[PDB]
Coordinates of all heavy atoms in Angstrom, one line a residue:
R1 N 55.5 109.4 95.2 CA 55.4 109.0 96.7 C 55.3 107.4 96.8 O 56.2 106.9 97.5 CB 54.2 109.6 97.3 CG 54.3 111.1 97.5 CD 53.5 111.5 98.8 NE 53.3 112.9 99.0 CZ 54.3 113.8 99.1 NH1 55.6 113.4 99.1 NH2 53.9 115.0 99.2
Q2 N 54.5 106.8 96.0 CA 54.3 105.3 96.1 C 55.5 104.7 95.6 O 55.9 103.6 96.2 CB 53.0 104.9 95.4 CG 51.8 105.6 95.8 CD 50.6 105.4 94.8 OE1 49.7 104.8 95.2 NE2 50.8 106.0 93.7
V3 N 56.1 105.2 94.5 CA 57.4 104.5 94.1 C 58.6 104.6 95.1 O 59.3 103.7 95.3 CB 57.8 105.2 92.7 CG1 59.0 104.3 92.1 CG2 56.7 105.1 91.7
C4 N 58.7 105.9 95.7 CA 59.8 106.1 96.6 C 59.6 105.3 97.9 O 60.6 105.0 98.5 CB 59.9 107.5 96.9 SG 60.6 108.5 95.4
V5 N 58.4 105.0 98.4 CA 58.2 104.2 99.7 C 58.5 102.8 99.5 O 58.4 102.1 100.4 CB 56.8 104.4 100.1 CG1 56.5 106.0 100.6 CG2 55.7 104.0 99.3
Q6 N 58.9 102.3 98.2 CA 59.2 101.0 98.1 C 60.7 100.7 98.2 O 61.0 99.5 98.3 CB 58.7 100.4 96.7 CG 57.3 100.8 96.3 CD 56.2 100.3 97.2 OE1 56.4 99.0 97.6 NE2 55.3 101.0 97.5
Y7 N 61.5 101.7 98.2 CA 63.0 101.4 98.0 C 63.7 101.1 99.4 O 64.9 100.7 99.3 CB 63.7 102.7 97.5 CG 63.6 102.7 95.9 CD1 62.4 102.9 95.3 CD2 64.8 102.5 95.1 CE1 62.3 102.9 93.9 CE2 64.6 102.4 93.8 CZ 63.5 102.6 93.1 OH 63.4 102.7 91.8
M8 N 62.9 101.2 100.5 CA 63.4 100.8 101.8 C 62.3 100.0 102.5 O 61.3 100.7 102.9 CB 64.0 102.0 102.7 CG 64.6 101.4 103.9 SD 66.0 100.4 103.7 CE 67.2 101.6 103.1
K9 N 62.4 98.8 102.6 CA 61.4 97.9 103.2 C 62.0 97.1 104.4 O 63.2 97.2 104.7 CB 60.8 97.0 102.2 CG 59.6 97.6 101.4 CD 58.8 96.7 100.7 CE 57.6 97.3 100.0 NZ 56.7 98.0 100.9
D10 N 61.2 96.2 104.9 CA 61.7 95.3 106.0 C 62.8 94.5 105.4 O 63.9 94.4 106.1 CB 60.5 94.3 106.3 CG 60.5 94.0 107.9 OD1 61.6 94.1 108.5 OD2 59.5 93.6 108.5
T11 N 62.6 93.9 104.2 CA 63.7 93.1 103.6 C 64.9 93.9 103.4 O 66.0 93.4 103.5 CB 63.2 92.5 102.4 OG1 62.0 91.7 102.6 CG2 64.2 91.5 101.8
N12 N 64.8 95.1 102.8 CA 66.0 96.0 102.6 C 66.7 96.3 103.8 O 67.8 96.5 103.8 CB 65.4 97.2 101.8 CG 66.6 97.9 101.1 OD1 67.6 97.4 100.8 ND2 66.4 99.2 100.9
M13 N 66.0 96.7 104.9 CA 66.6 97.0 106.1 C 67.3 95.8 106.7 O 68.4 95.9 107.3 CB 65.6 97.5 107.1 CG 66.2 98.2 108.3 SD 67.1 99.7 107.8 CE 65.8 100.9 107.5
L14 N 66.8 94.5 106.6 CA 67.4 93.3 107.0 C 68.7 93.2 106.2 O 69.8 92.8 106.7 CB 66.5 92.1 106.8 CG 67.2 90.8 106.7 CD1 67.7 90.3 108.0 CD2 66.2 89.7 106.2
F15 N 68.6 93.3 104.9 CA 69.8 93.3 104.1 C 70.9 94.3 104.5 O 72.0 94.0 104.5 CB 69.4 93.6 102.6 CG 70.6 93.4 101.6 CD1 71.2 92.2 101.5 CD2 71.0 94.6 100.9 CE1 72.2 92.0 100.5 CE2 72.1 94.4 100.0 CZ 72.7 93.1 99.9
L16 N 70.5 95.5 104.9 CA 71.4 96.5 105.3 C 72.0 96.2 106.6 O 73.3 96.3 106.8 CB 70.8 97.9 105.5 CG 71.6 99.1 106.0 CD1 72.8 99.3 105.0 CD2 70.7 100.4 106.1
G17 N 71.3 95.7 107.5 CA 71.9 95.2 108.8 C 72.8 94.0 108.6 O 73.9 94.0 109.2
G18 N 72.5 93.1 107.7 CA 73.4 91.9 107.4 C 74.7 92.5 106.8 O 75.8 92.0 107.1
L19 N 74.5 93.6 105.9 CA 75.7 94.1 105.2 C 76.6 94.8 106.3 O 77.8 94.8 106.2 CB 75.3 95.1 104.2 CG 74.6 94.6 102.9 CD1 74.3 95.9 102.0 CD2 75.6 93.8 102.1
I20 N 76.0 95.5 107.2 CA 76.9 96.1 108.3 C 77.4 95.1 109.2 O 78.8 95.3 109.5 CB 75.9 97.1 109.2 CG1 75.4 98.2 108.3 CG2 76.7 97.6 110.3 CD1 74.1 98.8 108.9
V21 N 76.9 94.0 109.5 CA 77.6 93.0 110.2 C 78.6 92.3 109.4 O 79.8 92.0 109.9 CB 76.5 91.8 110.7 CG1 77.2 90.7 111.3 CG2 75.5 92.5 111.6
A22 N 78.5 92.1 108.1 CA 79.5 91.7 107.2 C 80.6 92.6 107.0 O 81.8 92.2 107.1 CB 78.9 91.4 105.8
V23 N 80.4 93.9 107.1 CA 81.4 95.0 107.2 C 82.3 94.7 108.5 O 83.6 94.8 108.4 CB 80.9 96.4 107.1 CG1 81.9 97.4 107.4 CG2 80.3 96.7 105.7
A24 N 81.6 94.6 109.5 CA 82.3 94.2 110.8 C 83.2 92.9 110.6 O 84.3 92.9 111.1 CB 81.4 94.1 112.0
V25 N 82.6 92.0 110.1 CA 83.4 90.6 109.8 C 84.6 90.9 109.0 O 85.7 90.4 109.3 CB 82.5 89.6 109.3 CG1 83.3 88.4 108.8 CG2 81.4 89.2 110.3
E26 N 84.5 91.6 107.9 CA 85.6 91.9 107.0 C 86.6 92.9 107.5 O 87.8 92.8 107.2 CB 85.1 92.3 105.5 CG 84.0 91.5 105.0 CD 83.1 92.2 104.1 OE1 83.5 93.2 103.5 OE2 81.9 91.8 103.9
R27 N 86.2 93.7 108.4 CA 87.1 94.8 108.9 C 88.1 94.2 109.8 O 89.3 94.5 109.7 CB 86.3 95.8 109.7 CG 87.2 97.0 110.2 CD 86.4 98.1 110.9 NE 87.3 99.1 111.4 CZ 86.9 100.1 112.1 NH1 85.6 100.3 112.4 NH2 87.8 101.0 112.6
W28 N 87.7 93.2 110.6 CA 88.7 92.5 111.6 C 89.2 91.2 111.0 O 89.8 90.4 111.9 CB 87.9 92.2 112.9 CG 87.3 93.6 113.5 CD1 86.2 94.0 113.4 CD2 88.2 94.7 114.0 NE1 86.0 95.3 113.9 CE2 87.3 95.7 114.4 CE3 89.6 94.7 114.4 CZ2 87.8 96.8 115.0 CZ3 90.0 95.9 115.0 CH2 89.1 96.9 115.3
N29 N 89.0 90.9 109.8 CA 89.5 89.7 109.2 C 89.1 88.4 109.8 O 89.7 87.4 109.9 CB 91.1 89.7 109.0 CG 91.6 90.5 107.8 OD1 90.8 90.7 106.9 ND2 92.8 90.9 107.9
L30 N 87.9 88.4 110.4 CA 87.3 87.2 111.0 C 87.0 86.1 110.0 O 87.4 84.9 110.2 CB 86.1 87.5 111.7 CG 85.3 86.3 112.4 CD1 86.1 85.7 113.5 CD2 84.0 86.8 112.9
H31 N 86.5 86.5 108.8 CA 86.3 85.6 107.7 C 87.5 84.9 107.2 O 87.6 83.8 107.0 CB 85.4 86.3 106.6 CG 86.2 87.4 106.0 ND1 87.2 87.3 105.1 CD2 86.0 88.7 106.2 CE1 87.7 88.4 104.7 NE2 87.0 89.3 105.4
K32 N 88.5 85.8 107.0 CA 89.8 85.3 106.6 C 90.4 84.4 107.7 O 91.0 83.3 107.3 CB 90.8 86.5 106.4 CG 92.1 86.1 105.7 CD 92.6 87.2 104.9 CE 93.9 86.8 104.1 NZ 95.2 86.8 104.9
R33 N 90.3 84.6 108.9 CA 90.7 83.7 110.0 C 90.1 82.4 109.9 O 90.8 81.3 110.1 CB 90.6 84.4 111.3 CG 91.1 83.5 112.5 CD 91.1 84.2 113.8 NE 92.1 85.4 113.8 CZ 93.3 85.3 114.0 NH1 93.8 84.1 114.3 NH2 94.1 86.3 114.0
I34 N 88.8 82.4 109.8 CA 88.0 81.1 109.7 C 88.5 80.4 108.5 O 88.7 79.2 108.6 CB 86.4 81.4 109.7 CG1 86.0 82.0 111.0 CG2 85.6 80.2 109.3 CD1 84.7 82.8 110.8
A35 N 88.6 81.0 107.3 CA 89.0 80.4 106.2 C 90.4 79.7 106.3 O 90.6 78.6 106.0 CB 89.2 81.3 104.9
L36 N 91.4 80.5 106.8 CA 92.7 79.9 107.0 C 92.8 78.8 108.0 O 93.4 77.7 107.8 CB 93.7 81.1 107.4 CG 94.0 82.0 106.2 CD1 94.9 83.1 106.7 CD2 94.7 81.3 105.1
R37 N 92.1 78.9 109.1 CA 92.1 77.9 110.2 C 91.4 76.6 109.6 O 92.0 75.5 109.8 CB 91.3 78.4 111.4 CG 91.2 77.4 112.4 CD 92.6 77.0 113.1 NE 92.4 76.1 114.2 CZ 92.3 74.8 114.0 NH1 92.5 74.2 112.9 NH2 92.2 74.0 115.2

């Protein structure tokens, strides 16, 4: 129980949200557009 309740925390959820936003950025080639511009 105590080991398993460590694998998803505040920091890990923040990381997941940032990853989802990054998925949005990469899906629409926004990062590529910024790089090329």
Side-chain angles (χ1 to χ4, degrees):
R1 288 217 195 295
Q2 308 167 108
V3 188
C4 290
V5 298
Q6 313 299 319
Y7 280 68
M8 185 64 72
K9 278 200 174 292
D10 215 340
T11 304
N12 192 31
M13 200 59 78
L14 158 71
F15 184 65
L16 179 57
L19 287 178
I20 296 157
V21 176
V23 169
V25 167
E26 308 153 26
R27 184 177 179 179
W28 302 103
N29 275 343
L30 177 66
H31 61 78
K32 191 155 186 274
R33 180 173 294 280
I34 294 159
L36 289 176
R37 179 66 179 86

